[PDB]
Design a protein around this ligand. Structure first.
Ligand SMILES: [Ca+2]
Length: 279
């Protein structure tokens, strides 16, 4: 399959070189997989989700996305136009309020929720979680992310936007999950992206067009935007039978475009997510 005039990030994930604008992918498109988006929620009624999105949990007085951030992330995972895995099922877990804030205890509860709730969903090709959130180091937050991964969910988490070493942030610093840095259209590390030995992979994170609340669309930037590219890629690869939740991060790193990014600090991986699709 080929989507012409795709967002640059989708084109990049299917390309050995920057500067192209068509997204190429196997038509299976993540069918039979599920991705949980743990964030501010998802506007499920957005035409771009085609009935494939559902709120499953909230810790606040509403499950609606009153922010936009979660809807944007969900769109990059699996909207028809802006998504990597255009046939995946999307499940929203609102651990962040409409200001994008959340107490660590609520975030941890949301991760443990997904670890159980996947047993209530039909996801024969496998389960992914995209966590576009972060705060300072907390062993408890890291441990929750490790449990979620351990339960059989491919966990992708944002490295953070501090232009700092991700070892000081959680869940970014958790070794057993997939920590994702952000890059730009010109294959440079995004200026805000955290870095460090704890990073596993880079994905497109600067100027990312995707869905927003009120049925609209928006371009925004963050390691929160790179993460769902990787989450979506994982879902896509799992439906293709190429990998499993346990080894998808490893598989993505093994099959990445290597040594192509600039401004990568010494000791940080130079690996950009790539679907290796031969059209
Ligand atoms: Ca690891």
């Amino acid at each position: 399959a080929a989507q012409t005039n795709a967002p640059w990030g989708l084109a990049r994930i299917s390309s050995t070189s920057p500067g192209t604008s068509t997204y190429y992918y196997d038509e299976s498109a993540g069918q039979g997989s599920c991705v949980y988006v743990i964030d501010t929620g998802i506007e499920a009624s957005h035409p771009e989700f085609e009935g494939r999105a559902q709120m499953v949990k909230t810790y606040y007085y509403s499950s609606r996305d009153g922010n936009g951030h979660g809807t944007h992330c969900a769109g990059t995972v699996g909207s028809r136009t802006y998504g990597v895995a255009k046939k995946t099922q999307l499940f929203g877990v609102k651990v962040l309020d409409d200001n994008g804030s959340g107490q660590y205890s609520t975030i941890i509860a949301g991760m443990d929720f997904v670890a159980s709730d996947k047993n209530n969903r039909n996801c024969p090709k496998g389960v992914v979680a995209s966590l576009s959130l972060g705060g300072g180091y907390s062993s408890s937050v890291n441990s929750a992310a490790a449990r979620l991964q351990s339960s059989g969910v491919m966990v992708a988490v944002a490295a953070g936007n501090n232009n700092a070493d991700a070892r000081n942030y959680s869940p970014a610093s958790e070794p057993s999950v997939c920590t994702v840095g952000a890059s730009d259209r010109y294959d440079r590390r995004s200026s805000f992206s955290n870095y460090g030995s704890v990073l596993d992979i880079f994905g497109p994170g600067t100027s990312i067009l995707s869905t927003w609340i009120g049925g609209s669309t928006r371009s925004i930037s963050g390691t929160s935007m790179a993460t769902p590219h990787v989450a979506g890629l994982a879902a896509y690869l799992m439906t293709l039978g190429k990998t499993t939740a346990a080894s998808a991060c490893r598989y993505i790193a093994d099959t990445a475009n290597k040594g192509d990014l600039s401004n990568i600090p010494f000791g940080t991986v130079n690996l950009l997510a790539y679907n290796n699709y031969q059209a």
